[PDB]
Amino acid sequence: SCECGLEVPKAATVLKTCKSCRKTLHGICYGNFLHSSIEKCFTCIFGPSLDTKWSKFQDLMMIRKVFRFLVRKKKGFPASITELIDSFINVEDQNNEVKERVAFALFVFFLDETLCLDNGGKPSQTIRYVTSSVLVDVKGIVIPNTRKQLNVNHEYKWHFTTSSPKAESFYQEVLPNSRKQVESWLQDITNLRKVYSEALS
Amino acid sequence: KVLRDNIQGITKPAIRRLARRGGVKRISGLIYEETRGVLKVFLENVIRDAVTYTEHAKRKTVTAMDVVYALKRQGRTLYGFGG
Amino acid sequence: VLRDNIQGITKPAIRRLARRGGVKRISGLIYEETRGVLKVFLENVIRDAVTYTEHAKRKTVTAMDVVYALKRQGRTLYGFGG
Amino acid sequence: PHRYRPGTVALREIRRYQKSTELLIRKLPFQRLVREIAQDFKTDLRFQSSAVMALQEASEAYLVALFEDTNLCAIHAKRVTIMPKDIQLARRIRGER
Amino acid sequence: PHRYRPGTVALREIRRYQKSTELLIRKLPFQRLVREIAQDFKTDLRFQSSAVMALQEASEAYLVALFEDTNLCAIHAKRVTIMPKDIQLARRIRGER
Amino acid sequence: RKESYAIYVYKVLKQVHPDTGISSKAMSIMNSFVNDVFERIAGEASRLAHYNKRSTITSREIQTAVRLLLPGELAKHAVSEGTKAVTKYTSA
Amino acid sequence: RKESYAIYVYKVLKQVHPDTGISSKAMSIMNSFVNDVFERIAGEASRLAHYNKRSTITSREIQTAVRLLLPGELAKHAVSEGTKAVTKYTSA
Amino acid sequence: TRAKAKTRSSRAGLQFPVGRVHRLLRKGNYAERVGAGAPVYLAAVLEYLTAEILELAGNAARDNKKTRIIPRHLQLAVRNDEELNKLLGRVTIAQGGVLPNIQSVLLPK
Amino acid sequence: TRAKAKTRSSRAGLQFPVGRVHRLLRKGNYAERVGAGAPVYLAAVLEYLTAEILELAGNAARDNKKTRIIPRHLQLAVRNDEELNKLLGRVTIAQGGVLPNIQSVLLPK
DNA sequence: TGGAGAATCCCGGTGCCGAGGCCGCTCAATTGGTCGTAGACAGCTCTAGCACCGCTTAAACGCACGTACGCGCTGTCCCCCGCGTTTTAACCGCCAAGGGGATTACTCCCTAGTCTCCAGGCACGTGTCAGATATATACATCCTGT
DNA sequence: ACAGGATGTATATATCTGACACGTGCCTGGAGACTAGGGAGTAATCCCCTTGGCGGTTAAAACGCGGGGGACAGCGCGTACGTGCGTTTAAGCGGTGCTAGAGCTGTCTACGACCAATTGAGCGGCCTCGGCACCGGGATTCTCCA
Ligand SMILES: [Zn+2]
Ligand SMILES: [Zn+2]
């Protein structure tokens, strides 16, 4: 029923509801709102021209899903990427396309300094960070600045934070407001896709 | 808003029902005024101890367990509400 | 074997206890009932005192055994050890 | 008309209220009394719903037991009605006063 | 002859015994009573000298306090003498019976 | 994760009356009853060791504390039940 | 070797009434009074830590237990005496 | 290798737990050390008292023609019995009520 | 080297021992750990209550023209005061006696 | 002693919400082995509990006498109970905004453990003064007749 | 409403004596100086529960009035209890004599604490049906006045 179109395990999220159309919604897809009732959802705000099958919309949903899941878990990054994928995605729905989308989301997170690599200590002396050891198992992860791939079957120390000084607004705000904001977010997604494509090849 | 003069909420018919369960057949006319005084003293002692437990735990809400502990200290154990 | 020692608590002795309480005039049937009340009181205290003695594997009742027994029932006593 | 003689209805109510287990005081007026008393000790306090119910259960049990001792004192003086001096004697012997 | 009127000497003894702190029961008869009771629980027991004295101190304090409550019940019924039914009422209210 | 005696109380009920149930409100009262008696016996046994200058709580402390608390024939039957269980446990 | 508070009680007496003595029987009663109050306060403070799931007894537990036991103005004066001593000890 | 696992309750023929009771004694600030036979003795006593109350409560429910036990039935069992009444002499049971009792002098003549 | 030795009581200006009280708390099965300021707070409270009783007892002895305190004088001080009477409400003092009190109705008229 | 009449009890038909049973999994109970100290057991020393006898005098015991307190009966009148009307506030649904309790990693200070050593507190003598014990005296209170 | 006799209680003086205040010697426990690790404080985020407002329907509190019966005071009568005197009896005190059990060392072993690896029992979530509350009608019983 949700615009994401996938299924989430019960322990991962908490259900919500829209007041107008009265349909079940995912808590993580909307930023963990205070109350259990929401006035208007994406369909109510946008209108009949909202095609949920657009790739940009699905990428936006995936990014918001991952960010909210990590924030509400309050434990930093899990041990392995496959562990996260199995945690917040069912086995049946797991295909190559969602893996590519997860890789794109991780690249976007690395670009905005939300997720940072450990050189010799914590990045900032003021902003809180959480440090954990992650074993890389999937292939296709690109560090933006160094423009180099990450070796397979190796472990690295990663840092994670919530209130980054510079982060994209489409996964920072709680609820949508108007259609202009949504189309601006879609344009930003297009620009990020172009940058990822030009940096991968 | 400040509450005041709420002791009159304990009405005359309510007191007679409590006396009937005790087994009293006939009641005088001055009983009602003195009964209100006895009840007020009882509540002050219990409530004072309940708030003391709340402040030690650094909370702003009085819970059911705080009342149970206060009653047990005075020698009136209560069964049924947690504990 | 001792027997019929409850009569040692004489009539004049009971009147002296009543005078300290503040009693001016006494009936004639008070003396018999007072002996019954005292006997019940001693049985409860002495039973607990012996229980403490047996746990310690002794054959002599000490002063501290009496003090502990009284405190359990809710009558603290000051003056004898403790 | 068929008026019952005095005392007949009173005995009927004694049997009725010794057979049930409900509360005998209106809930809403009792809640306001509790909040007023607590203002002296601390201001801006909040209560749980079950916290107030615990107080009402203990309060009524205290009053019912008190009336039983009051009734015995009245009979000792060869009377039927209960009077304020009967309550005072019961509390004095019990040890509260 | 010079006989005092009834009640005059009784008031004189009340002031005398509320001014001293001595014991009011003969020591030797009291000791035999204690040993007789203890025979039921265990045989061939021995007592310390101070153990018996502790029992006598607590016993007399219990009886003196009981007579004060008995006196109040008699006055409540407009009498002066104390009667067996006054003792029974005091113990019932207190909670022993 | 909270703990209670609800599972164990229900087993005893089926031995006495095989076809009788119990409500949730009554279950809470029985749960409070067990905790209350636990503290009385355990607390009393602690003072017995302190008086005699010992550092261990054994079966003797438990047995003596029962006779001080329970009245009349309740203590007489409780002692036999406790003694019967200990000897069976030692054999096996 | 037995211990008692007899030495310390005598020092306090000389501050209040410099030329008054005390008998041996009265000394025993005062000794029992101190032990009785010690157990009431220490025992109550033990339960406060258990309720809040703590492993340490601090000044807060002692202060709260005093207000629960002592009645009326006795508690008011006792708190000031205890607070005054702690701050002086910390400075030196 | 390891030869299965038997609960300590089964070795004593009891229904109440023995391992749980042992843990509560140790983490309760009662004494420095706890013996081996102490948990077995205490568990048996608690079970005996529980069966005593439940038997009397079940009889009261049968007289009222019901198949469940409510707090009213627990009140009747305790107060009618003499030994249990003395044990729980300062305990209030919620929603219990009182026993029917009227003084004789008040009755009509 | 070591710089002399000062008792912890002297640092707080008290008369009651502080080191002894600390030992009793630790070897008493009250808690796992004991703080540093707890013994100082408890010692001050005990000293305050002791001075309260002794002052009233000394006045009673002076009224009777004696220079020593006997158990009779302790009884008068406690019972006449209102706060101390409520604290020691279930305590018996050996060789204490009672306060003089006669009901008015019994007096001659 | 008999009828009316009101209050209580007994039976059958409906429906709904709470108690009883099943399953996945995770965390707490079980099994096997090592090490150190708490308490069981034996022996000895000297304290305090028990038993008996003679003597002096204070408290317990039995009896006569009479006055004051307890108990039953009668008459007044005032205050509380029972029933019908009129009025006030408790009770039940629904909605909304916000306060405060619960969870988790990070960080640092405070308490336990160990070794050395020396003053503070306890056990044992010693003398002297506050309290105990007679005696002579002065004052206050009760009771019967005036 | 007094006068005076008779009895009980408080006051000032002079000798004894044993319990309390003080001094001395000795040793066990508290203080000084370190180190290591974990227990509790803090900030950011999630999310449910307590508080306040609005409207309608009906149960319950408030008021008035007539009688009936119980609380209260007064009076009379029979006897149980207080006061005083003479005779009898164990309590209290000072000895002597004897032995049981309390209290303290010394030796050594069986028992409880602690750790690592393994696994199954109990907790949380979910369905599902039947036990009990409610309503309507007939039958039975208890109170009241002729
Ligand atoms: Zn979704
Ligand atoms: Zn919508």
Numbering used by the authors:
A (entry chain P): 331 to 531
B (entry chain B): 20 to 102
C (entry chain F): 21 to 102
D (entry chain A), E (entry chain E): 38 to 134
F (entry chain H), G (entry chain D): 30 to 121
H (entry chain G), I (entry chain C): 10 to 118
The article reads:
In S. cerevisiae, the HORMAD protein Hop1 mediates the enrichment of axis proteins at nucleosome-rich islands through a central chromatin-binding region (CBR). Here, we use cryoelectron microscopy to show that the Hop1 CBR directly recognizes bent nucleosomal DNA through a composite interface in its PHD and winged helix–turn–helix domains. The Hop1 CBR comprises tightly associated PHD and winged helix–turn–helix (wHTH) domains and directly recognizes the bent DNA on nucleosomes. In S. cerevisiae, the HORMAD ortholog Hop1 contributes to axial element integrity and acts in the very early stages of meiotic recombination by mediating the recruitment of the DSB-forming endonuclease Spo11 and its accessory proteins.
